Design a protein around this nucleic acid. Structure first.
Ligand SMILES: [Zn+2]
Ligand SMILES: [Zn+2]
Ligand SMILES: [Zn+2]
Lengths: 149, 1168, 105, 71
RNA sequence: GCGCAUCAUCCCGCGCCACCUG
RNA sequence: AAGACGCGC
């Protein structure tokens, strides 16, 4: 948090420690790892360090399914930082997996994550929206984007 | 892997316009906003010309722009609403020549959001409040007031939100010193989404909501809600108060409605239509733009229709009641996004596409011969269009905004690449050839035998407007000419000189100086000649010409100093300069306005050394500096804007040394290696320098920036100036064994172009390898071909003949005899699924065509290419993609066809061979390895030439969406999907199969792709993003590629190429956007330069924010985060800030502003 | 604010006045409570600034001695383009603290 | 308990929001972004032989009820 | 009832928001 | 000595 943008060189040195901390051993370890990830993501934003940030997100993501308010807040902050760093496209891709899951709790958490992503930087989701095939009664395809010059 | 972003050409298209007194004077000025550039420009009433005065970039998207002024004031402020969630009020300072921010208030998140204000902006006519509105659910009101310090003040925003409503247009309403009033086309949709029966479209009418602004209660409340018969488009503010009645005009389909609060009856008036419309009668007519003229005697409104008809709207009203609305046809102009009516009888038209014109109103046409319409007439209306009568064209601004395809190649004899751009829309489409250099004018031709080394012009007066004596001196001959409006030889020159004239200038009022290698002469009206012979058998090389300073240079460096006393005689100083080196070139400084003699003086040598001579009597003819040079000096000159000197040597260089006794900045560029002589020229009444070489170059400085531009002409050995009443800006630049006169009419800063008119808009074109000919295909939607138009006209003629109007219907011959021009009066076309297609071959050198091919009414041309086949010989076949029955809004196509031609006789004509049906539309044509690639929907096909039709060879049904472009190189091809980024396909020739081995992970709506290497591909985006994708080195031929670069230009990009521009330079990635701008990308040659540029960009971002309060990092990271791209716009704008901050950041970077500017200009002068 | 979830913000339209902070909250961020990189000022709403409420600390509610500021991270996260960041609640901890202090004092 | 900003925003879904509402919100956001962006509007007006005013007028009318009638 | 753990969480001794009073 | 939160013998 203190160094800011200068610490992009030391990202590689702490990746094994972050991977070890993100393992399902202690809740406090997960909270600290999420805080570290969020602070680093905010610090190194705008300088092209997505290669390690995506790998960190690959382990941070399975921590969403938690009940303790503190770890939920830490995970939400980490995912918000990863969203503002990587971009809303990857976040939308991850959150589109279970937006309509048969179960209820997973649907609720996916919907709240999607709302958090949608509140900030809404102007890029339009380009990051996927394609949905229309039904026989409603139109779900934006034909205006298929124009070719 | 780091590139530097530059901008060679700024955006030209105009999206908004406004007028007012932005300088505090009576002179009107026009403020128009580009896509992301805000610039100020004003016309000159005396000459009608338009010149730009200021141009800055806001790094944001502008959605609204208008001006206002406080009551009793004299200056108009500027309010702009950008994509950022804040509002800013601007102000123009004539002294600083820049926009000064006065206020900045934030009210929401940034970005073009649905429920964020900024789309609609309204200002009260009196100038007491401003209203900003969003698309849905949001509305804010601000109060504008002036404090006791005569400064603008901003109050708190007001809550005016209404849930589940849609707003079409917001505009202020005049009240006449009452509480400010605002009207909007608010409508609700809550019941629309709650009805499953589908009746949402029906029984849903618009409402005209009115909003007060109670200053006493400091709150806003809805006033009325009046349902409307039909949907409206936009509103008009009628000047109320003492001058006219308050009200609003509603523009709708084929109707105009007048409404006012109280007991005002509604007034309706149908929009008149042309005589014998060629369009579909079922199509409606709406309004695109409107203007006003609040004259004290009588006000009137101007409006433009879809087809460009200008209607002069006159409102007839009683003291408090409206009686009728009288429409009248004024003229016809090309469709314009915004129109402003200027004072002093001037009209400015900002056309939607193409060039922008500036008409001049001469006759108001009050009750002319053409009858006028009114709302009192019972039941439609018809009028006959006429050519331009009321307006007179004076000046127009060249524009190339709608560029669809750009290619660069060296198709001419000169060794300089030419930029070919395909721009324009509809009948106004044209092909322009952008050439780097300056404009060349040709009006006088004189072939004089001999060897004219140089020409000298001396006037009979110190500031005579016309030339008196012209010294046409040859190498081996002598002659004198004069101009007196009749070019004839002069007799009373009295020169008596046989040897070639070294120089002739204006020593006094009419004092001419003639120098010959055998002595010194003097020319004067009176009998005052200081004739002196050369000492001994020596010779004179060069002489000094100035107002009151004359120095003659002879062999051995023996300089003689001549000073002109006020008496008139010439005197020689007691001190003489002597060295062991001769003098071959030298220059002099202009006399100070107050002082009778200057001090700066530089004289060259032969030993590659230049010195400084002091003109003061204390140390006259004494050395000052010992500055060596790489080569022998050739010329020198001093350029004003505050003083700079240019040094010329034997090789081609031009050192821009700052005014100082010792050399300072060392910045020289190539001008091969021919000797360069420097001479003064004329440019907008200023002083500049000229360089002569194998190709001539000119340097000018406009607003603290130096631009080097060559001349588009053959080699020139000498040049001079020319002054005349008709053409004050004249250049006498003679050439080899001929005399040529040049002029600079337009600015011609960069990319001079020539207009080659077309018929329809161009989509794609190719270049013949050996024929060097362009094959352009054109296509328009909802268009009628020539045969269809003729058939429709004949059918209408037969119908009106059958009408049998009394037998007496003889108007058919007149109707069919005259046809309105398509470029001026527009192209009357209509339909829902109509298309057009024309195949044209044009010679690039001239404007003439070679062949024209026309297809059926329902055929659309998409792709075209020329190639050869292994089965046939060396014939160049042409394949054209043709679509059949294409419907746009609902995706449904009946089929498609592909054409084949032979192109015999070195590409001068085309012959039809056969056609092959295709199930879907052909996307693109990609020939490789003696075959072609055909893009059929989501299937990839390989076709080979046959006897009657193309033969199927391979298929690939593993592509999901529709192909939109194929590029090939080596043994692999790339497929650009409409949604997916890129698809990598390798063709196995032995197996005769297509295998996909690599693909991207981030989808993007790519438009144009341009590969840079065997595994690196660069592609654009439909939203205005540029990305570079590199294949991993460990790929095998699943595997996914990775993106290494991302950027957001801000405008849609439809061109991408990597070719060199300047000869002797380096490869650059030049791109052209849909807004008319041209930019290049420059790699970094060193790590230190990259670090310095990154530090400068970061410091400028932290210290100098953009004008509209938008985050530069967020703006560049609009859709994707920026990656390995450094913006150069901030670096170039660094030269425009006030000295304090630039110097401060200079020591903050441990550097100095001069070398910083030198480094900034080094990239521009190296890669461009 | 961040530590205590009970405290809530008014979240009204921002005005033109500038909020103030006391000596204890001199460097604290109004959202995340950080003392790193203060960049932009803090705007207060009309309701939160009226009469006696003028010149009061945003976080706790003491006398105002220094101007409030937004940190670099809050500016990056686009969190400053929101409603009034002033706590309208008095806090559960403060009530109990005052009651126990009055009892044992 | 900082869900006030979630509820005070229009255009976002929640636990039992069906597909139709999400798609109509997506279409409305797309239309608004098309209107805001000058470059995409210019591209649309170049693709079809029409005017920007007509294009934006039609786009406004398309905002009444996208994705057909509700079910 | 035991052992624990997290939030640069509190540790500030009393504060003051239009008022009492014939 | 205090506001909340989650962890099993
Ligand atoms: Zn405080
Ligand atoms: Zn507040
Ligand atoms: Zn903060």
């Amino acid at each position: 948090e203190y160094i800011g943008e200068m610490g992009k060189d030391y990202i590689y040195a702490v990746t094994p420690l972050l991977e070890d901390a993100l393992m399902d051993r202690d809740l406090v370890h997960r909270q600290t790892a999420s805080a570290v990830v969020q602070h680093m993501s905010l610090g190194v934003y705008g300088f092209g360090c997505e290669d390690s940030l995506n790998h960190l997100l690959n382990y941070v993501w399975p921590n969403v399914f938690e009940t303790s308010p503190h770890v939920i807040q830490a995970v939400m902050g980490a995912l918000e930082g990863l969203r503002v760093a990587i971009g809303p496209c990857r976040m939308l891709q991850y959150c589109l997996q279970g937006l309509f899951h048969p179960a209820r709790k997973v649907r609720d958490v996916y919907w709240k994550i999607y709302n958090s992503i949608y509140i900030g930087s809404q102007d890029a989701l339009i380009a990051h929206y996927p394609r949905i095939y229309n039904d026989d009664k409603n139109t779900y395809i934006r034909y205006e984007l298929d124009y070719i010059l | 892997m780091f590139l530097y972003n530059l901008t060679l050409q700024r955006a030209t298209g105009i999206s908004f316009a406004i007028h007012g007194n932005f300088s505090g004077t009576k002179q009107q000025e026009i403020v128009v906003s580009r896509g992301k550039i805000l610039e100020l420009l004003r016309p000159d009433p005396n000459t009608g010309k338009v010149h730009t005065l200021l141009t800055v970039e806001v790094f944001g998207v502008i959605r609204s722009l208008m001006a206002f002024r406080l009551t009793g004031g004299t200056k108009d402020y500027i309010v702009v609403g950008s994509d950022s969630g804040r509002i800013v009020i601007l102000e123009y300072q004539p002294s600083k020549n820049m926009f000064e921010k006065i206020h900045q208030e934030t009210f929401g998140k940034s970005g073009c959001r649905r429920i964020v204000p900024g789309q609609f902006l309204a200002v009260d006519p009196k100038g007491r409040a401003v209203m900003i509105s969003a698309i849905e659910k949001q509305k804010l009101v601000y109060i504008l007031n002036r404090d006791a310090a005569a400064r603008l003040t901003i109050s708190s925003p007001l809550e005016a939100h209404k849930a589940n409503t849609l707003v079409y247009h917001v505009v202020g309403v005049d009240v006449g010193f009452e509480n400010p009033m605002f009207a909007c086309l608010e409508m609700d949709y809550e019941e629309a989404d709650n009805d499953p029966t589908g009746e949402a479209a029906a029984n849903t009418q618009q409402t005209l909501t009115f909003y007060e602004l109670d200053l006493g209660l400091n709150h806003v409340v809805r006033k009325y809600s009046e349902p409307l018969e039909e949907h409206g488009n936009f509103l008009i503010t009628v000047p109320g108060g003492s001058d006219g009645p308050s009200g609003v005009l509603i523009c709708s389909e084929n109707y105009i409605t007048y409404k006012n609060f109280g007991d005002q009856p509604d007034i309706r008036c149908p929009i008149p239509r042309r005589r014998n419309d060629l369009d579909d009668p079922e199509r409606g007519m709406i309004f695109v733009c409107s203007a006003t003229h609040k004259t004290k005697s009588m006000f009137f409104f101007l409006a433009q229709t879809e087809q460009g008809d200008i209607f002069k709207i006159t409102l007839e009203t009683d003291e408090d009641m409206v009686t009728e609305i009288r429409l009248k046809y004024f003229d016809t102009v090309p469709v314009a996004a915004a129109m402003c009516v200027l004072k002093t009888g001037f009209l400015f038209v900002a056309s939607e596409f193409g060039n922008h014109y500036l008409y001049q109103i001469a006759h108001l046409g009050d009750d002319d011969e053409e009858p006028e319409f009114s709302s009192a007439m019972p039941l439609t209306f018809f009028f006959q269009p006429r050519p331009l009568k009321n307006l007179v064209l004076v000046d127009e601004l060249d524009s190339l905004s709608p560029i669809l395809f750009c290619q660069i190649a060296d198709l001419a004899n000169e060794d300089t690449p030419q930029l070919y751009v395909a721009c324009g829309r509809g009948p106004r489409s044209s092909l322009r050839v952008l050439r780097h250099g300056l404009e060349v004018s040709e009006m006088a031709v004189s072939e004089l035998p001999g060897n004219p080394n140089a020409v000298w012009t001396v006037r009979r007066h110190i500031e005579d407007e016309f030339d008196a004596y012209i010294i046409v001196s040859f190498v081996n001959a002598t002659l004198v000419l004069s101009i007196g409006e009749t070019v004839e030889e002069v007799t009373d020159s009295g020169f008596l000189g046989t040897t070639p004239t070294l120089s002739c200038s204006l020593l006094g009022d009419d004092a001419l100086v003639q120098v010959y290698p055998d002595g010194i002469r003097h020319i004067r009206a009176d009998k005052r000649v200081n004739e002196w012979k050369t000492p001994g058998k020596k010779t004179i090389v060069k002489c000094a010409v100035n107002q009151r300073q004359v120095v003659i240079a002879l062999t051995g460096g023996e300089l003689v100093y001549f000073e002109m006393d006020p008496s008139g005689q010439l005197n020689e100083y007691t001190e003489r300069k002597e060295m062991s080196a001769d003098v071959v070139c030298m220059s002099l400084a202009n006399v100070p306005p107050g002082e009778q003699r200057s001090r700066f003086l530089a004289v060259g040598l032969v030993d590659n050394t230049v010195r400084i001579i002091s003109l003061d009597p204390s140390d006259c003819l004494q050395p000052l500096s010992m500055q060596a040079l790489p080569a022998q000096p050739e010329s020198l000159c001093i350029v004003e804007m505050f003083l700079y000197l240019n040094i010329g040597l034997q090789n081609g260089v031009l050192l821009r040394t700052v005014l100082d006794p010792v050399t300072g900045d060392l910045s020289d560029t190539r001008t091969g290696s021919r000797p360069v002589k420097l001479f003064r020229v004329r440019m907008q009444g200023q002083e500049a320098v000229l360089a002569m070489s194998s190709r001539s170059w000119l340097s000018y400085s406009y607003q603290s920036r130096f631009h080097l531009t060559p001349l588009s002409y053959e080699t020139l050995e000498f040049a001079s100036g020319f002054a005349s009443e008709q053409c004050p800006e004249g250049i006498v630049a003679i050439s080899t064994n001929t005399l040529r006169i040049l002029a600079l009419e337009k600015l011609g800063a960069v990319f001079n172009q020539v207009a080659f008119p077309l018929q329809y808009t161009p989509r794609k074109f190719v270049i013949h390898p050996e024929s060097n000919n362009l094959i352009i295909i054109e296509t328009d939607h909802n268009a009628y071909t020539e045969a269809t138009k003729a058939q429709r006209k004949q059918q209408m003629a037969e119908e009106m003949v059958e009408a049998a109007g009394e037998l007496a219907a003889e108007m058919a011959a007149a109707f069919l005899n005259e046809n309105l021009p398509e470029s001026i009066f527009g192209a009357p076309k209509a339909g829902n699924g109509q298309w057009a297609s024309v195949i044209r071959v044009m010679n690039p050198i001239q404007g003439n065509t070679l062949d024209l091919v026309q297809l059926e009414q329902n055929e659309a041309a998409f792709s075209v290419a020329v190639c050869r086949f292994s089965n046939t010989g060396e014939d160049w076949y042409v394949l054209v993609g043709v679509a059949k029955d294409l419907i746009l809004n609902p995706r449904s196509v009946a089929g498609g066809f592909v054409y084949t031609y032979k192109l015999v006789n070195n590409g001068e004509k085309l012959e039809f061979l056969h056609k092959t049906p295709v199930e879907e539309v052909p996307a693109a044509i990609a020939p490789f390895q003696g075959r072609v690639l055909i893009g059929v929907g989501k299937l990839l096909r390989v076709y080979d030439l046959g006897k009657k039709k193309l033969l199927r060879k391979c298929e690939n049904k593993h592509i999901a969406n529709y192909i939109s472009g194929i590029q090939t190189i080596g043994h692999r091809v790339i497929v650009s999907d409409v949604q997916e980024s890129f698809i990598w396909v390798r063709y196995k020739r032995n197996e005769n199969q297509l295998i996909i081995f690599a693909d991207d992970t981030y989808p993007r709506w790519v438009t144009t792709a341009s590969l840079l290497d065997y595994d690196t591909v660069a592609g654009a985006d439909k939203f205005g993003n540029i990305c570079v994708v590199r294949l991993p080195p460990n790929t095998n031929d699943s595997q996914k590629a990775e993106v290494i670069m991302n950027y957001h230009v801000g405008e849609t990009v439809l061109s991408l190429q990597k070719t060199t521009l300047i000869p002797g330079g380096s490869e650059s990635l030049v791109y052209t956007t849909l807004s008319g701008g041209i930019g290049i990308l420059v790699p970094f040659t060193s790590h230190e330069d990259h670090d310095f540029f990154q530090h400068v960009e970061m410091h400028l971002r932290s210290e100098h924010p953009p004008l509209c309060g938008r985050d530069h990092l967020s703006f560049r990271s609009y859709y994707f985060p920026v990656k390995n791209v450094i913006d150069g716009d901030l670096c170039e704008q660094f030269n425009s800030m006030e000295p304090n901050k630039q110097k401060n950041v200079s020591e903050e970077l441990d550097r100095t502003p001069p070398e910083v500017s030198k480094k900034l200009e080094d990239i521009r002068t190296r890669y461009a | 604010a961040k530590h205590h979830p009970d405290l809530i913000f008014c979240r009204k339209q921002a005005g033109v006045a500038i909020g103030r902070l006391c000596e204890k909250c001199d460097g604290k961020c109004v959202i995340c409570d950080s003392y790193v990189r203060p960049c932009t000022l803090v705007r207060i709403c009309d309701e939160c600034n009226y009469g006696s409420y003028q010149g009061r600390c945003v976080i706790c509610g003491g006398p105002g001695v220094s101007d409030a500021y937004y940190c670099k991270e809050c500016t990056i996260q686009e969190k400053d383009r929101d409603g009034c960041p002033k706590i309208v609640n008095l806090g559960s901890s403060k009530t109990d603290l005052f009651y126990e202090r009055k009892k044992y004092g | 308990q900082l869900e006030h900003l979630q509820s005070k925003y229009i255009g976002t879904g929640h636990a039992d929001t069906t597909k139709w509402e999400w798609l109509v919100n997506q279409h409305r956001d797309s239309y608004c972004s098309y209107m805001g962006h000058f470059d995409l509007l210019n591209y649309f007006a170049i693709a079809e032989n029409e005017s920007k005013a007509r294009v934006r007028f039609n786009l406004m009318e398309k905002m009444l009820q996208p994705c057909g009638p509700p079910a």
